[PDB]
Amino acid sequence: GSHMDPAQLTEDITRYYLCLQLRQDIVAGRLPCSFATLALLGSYTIQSELGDYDPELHGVDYVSDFKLAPNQTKELEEKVMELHKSYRSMTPAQADLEFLENAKKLSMY
Numbered sequence: 001g002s003h004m005d006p007a008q009l010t011e012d013i014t015r016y017y018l019c020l021q022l023r024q025d026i027v028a029g030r031l032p033c034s035f036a037t038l039a040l041l042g043s044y045t046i047q048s049e050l051g052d053y054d055p056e057l058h059g060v061d062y063v064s065d066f067k068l069a070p071n072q073t074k075e076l077e078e079k080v081m082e083l084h085k086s087y088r089s090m091t092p093a094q095a096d097l098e099f100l101e102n103a104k105k106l107s108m109y
Contacts, residue, residue, distance in 0.1 A: 015096065019045065022103050027067045031108060039076055041099050042068030043083035048095035053085045 023045060025031050026038070033041075046066055047053075063080045103109065 015100065018103075018109070019096075019099065022099075022108055023067075025108070027069055029070050035076060035079075037102070037106070038069050039079035039083060041102055042066070042076070042080050043087075044095050044099040044102070046080060047084050047087060047090065048092060048099070051092065052090070055085075 023041075026033060026041065042063075045068070046063060049066060050062075060081075063077055068080055069076060
C-alpha cells in the first residue's frame with residue numbers, strides 16, 4: 001500500500017513552478033496559441049486555483065482575478081466560466097494533469 005511519500009516533494013516543487021512559468025508565458029503572449037487552447041488551459045488553471053465551482057456564492061466577474069491572457073474578451077471569459085462549471089465532479093489532480101498534459105502535448109517547454 002502506502003500512498004503518502006515525504007520524498008515525492010520535488011515533483012511538487014517542479015509542477016508548481018512549471019504552471020507559474022507556463023501561465024506567465026501565455027499571459028504575456030510569449031507563445032502563439034489559439035482561443036480554444038487559451039480558454040482550455042485557463043479553465044483548468046481556474047478550477048485548480050479555486051477548486052470546484054459554487055453557484056451559492058456566485059461571481060460572474062471572478063475570472064477577472066486570474067490573468068488567463070493579455071487580450072481577454074467576453075468570449076474567452078465566457079468560455080472560462082462555462083468550461084469551469086461544465087466540468088462534472090472533477091478532482092484537483094485531474095485539473096493539474098489536464099493543463100500539464102495539454103502543455104506537454106503541445107511542447108510548450
